[PDB]
């Protein structure tokens, strides 16, 4: 039937960036220009494709990776970027063909006192490989002495809370991000606009 974009975009809750959500979308008709023609998104960048040309095109599989980050970190959801998000949470490949769609979600994802339900990884020994999801909660060894699951000196909790408050600066407010990855393989194309 019609591709479930509403399920992805209009979800009650979103994932933390470290444990980003992926939705495989296949065997349906998708109107990509009805998404672009939705006056609400603060970001609609497309890499290796156009949002109109997207409609009259066929793909093997299309993924929808959703998560929440702060606005000044939306710049890192792009090919060849660096920062705690690109490096330790969500990395896009250089040869990325897809679209990055973001919007201010301060109305839903910021509580008075602080929303502590949204996390991001602050510590990691090395950068993530493109499309890698690291959900390890293992106590981070910043020294020579082993941690053995005990948080303490030189033993950090890898994940940090965003603490979204409604009084935060616009750049430091929660933004909901959806990344559409377009896959094209030798197998038949099950996702199209007007076929």
């Amino acid at each position: 039937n019609l591709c479930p974009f509403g399920e992805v975009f209009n979800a009650t809750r979103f994932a933390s960036v470290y444990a980003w959500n992926r939705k495989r979308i296949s065997n349906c008709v998708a109107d990509y220009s009805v998404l672009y023609n939705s006056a609400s998104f603060s970001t609609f960048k497309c890499y290796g494709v156009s949002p109109t040309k997207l409609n009259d095109l066929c793909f093997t599989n299309v993924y929808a990776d959703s998560f929440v980050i702060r606005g000044d970190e939306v710049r890192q959801i792009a090919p060849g970027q660096t920062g705690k998000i690109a490096d330790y949470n969500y990395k896009l490949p250089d040869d990325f063909t897809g679209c990055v769609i973001a919007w201010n979600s301060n109305n839903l994802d910021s509580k008075v006192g602080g929303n502590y339900n949204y996390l991001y990884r602050l510590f990691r020994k090395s950068n993530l490989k493109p499309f890698e999801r690291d959900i390890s909660t293992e106590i981070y060894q910043a020294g020579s002495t082993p941690c053995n699951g005990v948080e303490g000196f030189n033993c950090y909790f890898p994940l940090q809370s965003y603490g979204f408050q409604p009084t935060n600066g616009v750049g430091y407010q929660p933004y909901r991000v959806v990344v559409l990855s377009f896959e094209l393989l030798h197998a038949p194309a099950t996702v199209c606009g007007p076929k």
Partner: antibody
């Protein structure tokens, strides 16, 4: 205990180059964010540069393109290569463990400082 | 750009007095703020991190409060050794702006 020891400071003529070092013992520099903060004589503090566990580096606008931060994992040292030095760069340079952006912990361990005097 | 306005610039206080220093941010920075104590000829020492969390080793008389824009540092019962310049620092984004400093003088 945790110790950070700077070296490499001194007098350098305007336009010159200097390489500060920071030998750390008590933690692993490669597993940590390592910042450099400077203090102009009689003035306040100012962050200069940072090096992530994963390799990413960031600089303050005032030093972008002139300074380079790096590290030696075997020596547990952090380097800051300052090039094209001007009189404004005359300051006590400190290295510290931590980061200044989204890093709630702040700069906990700091070096003793090393005076870099840019003068003719 | 995040501007940090730390006040007072200077303050003289007798031993045993309760001293408060304020730092005000131009934008909402949540709890991303730290307080440092700098004694003459020595590197800054971290006192409070995450706006209100006291650092290990720091005496109980130091306390942090505030979230969003207005933050304060309090020294419940000032000691002679507490003479130093105190700096706040925003840890929300680069370039990790520090306050102007508050030079604390011991009244004697």
């Amino acid at each position: 205990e945790v110790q950070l020891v700077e070296s490499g400071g001194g007098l350098i003529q305007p336009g010159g180059s200097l390489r500060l070092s920071c030998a750390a013992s008590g933690f692993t520099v490669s597993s940590n964010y390592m910042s450099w903060v400077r203090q102009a004589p009689g003035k306040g503090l100012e962050w200069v540069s940072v090096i992530y566990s994963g390799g990413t580096t960031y600089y303050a606008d005032s030093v972008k393109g002139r300074f380079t931060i790096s590290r030696d994992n075997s020596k547990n040292t952090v380097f800051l290569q300052m090039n094209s030095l001007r009189a404004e760069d005359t300051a006590v340079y400190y290295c510290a463990r931590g980061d200044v952006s989204g890093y709630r912990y702040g700069l906990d361990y700091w070096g003793q400082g090393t005076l870099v005097t840019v003068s003719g | 750009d995040i501007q940090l306005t730390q006040s007072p610039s200077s303050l003289s206080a007798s031993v045993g007095d309760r001293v408060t220093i304020t730092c005000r941010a131009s934008q909402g920075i949540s709890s991303y703020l730290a307080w440092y104590q700098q004694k003459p000829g020595k590197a800054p020492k971290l006192l409070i991190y995450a706006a209100s969390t006291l650092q290990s080793g720091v005496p109980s008389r130091f306390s942090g409060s505030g979230s969003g824009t207005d933050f304060t540092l309090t020294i419940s019962s000032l000691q002679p050794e507490d003479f130093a310049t105190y700096y706040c620092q925003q840890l929300n984004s680069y370039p990790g702006t520090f306050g102007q400093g508050t030079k604390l003088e011991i009244k004697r």
